[PDB]
Design a protein around this ligand. Structure first.
Ligand SMILES: Cc1cn([C@H]2C[C@H](OP(=O)(O)O)[C@@H](COP(=O)(O)O)O2)c(=O)[nH]c1=O
Ligand SMILES: [Ca+2]
Length: 129
């Protein structure tokens, strides 16, 4: 897997972000996670968390997995990094996302994220409280 440059356009909610990638605007959906919708419990906090993470970054990077790179809605499917820290992993680690939508062939970081989820749940953080 490879990290590729991109620049923030707009944080959208806990697990979607608009980025400029290869010079084109696109909505990215974070692989292997599910945050609550903004209307649900911890939704605003997931949104706020993702936003701060990408807005504070000097460097945003996109990492595609080995399988499909866009979903059925045209959203990019990637791991997103903020100054080298994976946003997908961080959300799970804080108990602001569940590991979710694990499809064969786009699951390189599954076991890393499940480990973070186990730590969040142990700590009774946020959605696990
Ligand atoms: C994360 C991810 C979501 N999706 C699709 C599955 C779901 O279809 P449905 O919309 O039919 O439920 C939807 C979940 O996205 P959201 O959690 O953003 O709503 O996005 C993929 O197809 N591949 C993926 O890797
Ligand atoms: Ca969601």
């Amino acid at each position: 897997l490879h990290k590729e440059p991109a620049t923030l356009i707009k944080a959208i909610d806990g697990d979607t972000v608009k980025l400029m990638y290869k010079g084109q605007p696109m909505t990215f959906r974070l692989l292997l996670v599910d945050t609550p919708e903004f209307n649900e419990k911890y939704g605003p906090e997931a949104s706020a968390f993702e936003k701060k993470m990408v807005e504070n970054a000097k460097k945003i990077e996109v990492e595609f997995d080995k399988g499909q790179r866009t979903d059925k809605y045209g959203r990019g499917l990637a791991y997103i990094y903020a100054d080298g820290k994976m946003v997908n992993e961080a959300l799970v680690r804080q108990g602001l996302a569940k590991v979710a939508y694990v499809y064969k062939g786009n699951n390189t970081h599954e076991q890393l994220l499940r480990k973070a989820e186990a730590q969040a749940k142990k700590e009774k953080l946020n959605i696990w409280s």
